[PDB]
Amino acid sequence: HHHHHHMVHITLDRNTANSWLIISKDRRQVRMGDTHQNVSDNKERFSNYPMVLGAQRFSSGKMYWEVDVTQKEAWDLGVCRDSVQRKGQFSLSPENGFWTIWLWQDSYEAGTSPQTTLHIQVPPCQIGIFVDYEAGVVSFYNITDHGSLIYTFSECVFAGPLRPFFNVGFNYSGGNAAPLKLCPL
């Protein structure tokens, strides 16, 4: 792929974070804390899952960014509507405003309804995410495997502004503490 030149500088929005997340000073890394992080509740915070949004909102154009997932056992990445539900239980699907892939229990899947099996020969340490707003496309790339395509959502019906979306995952196993990191341009 030749999407690198649409690179955008993404930062995390503290105000949207689940109350157990720890966002770095530069707003480029997030990890699961071992407890509540001593913040007030607000209507923007994801309550049920270890999720956070990017600060940037996109309503046009082509955008590209990269995320480091090294040594994590579980995570979700992609984009979502600015108006997605924050409280209670929900599935990651385009019907609910999410265009995502994930790792869970040693398998990679795209957040369709129902979910789609991904075929990845080289487990990725960094994921590239490409959004073409006008075309209705979200694509995922394996940076560890020379940029190979992972998955394309096409005919997307965004139906509003988009925000970068992250889930660091739970750490019940003690093997998923590592952060998600936004990689330098």
Ligand SMILES: CNc1ccccc1S(C)(=O)=O
């Ligand atoms: C960057 N991760 C971090 C930061 C502070 C404390 C512990 C960790 S760890 C390597 O145990 O996930």
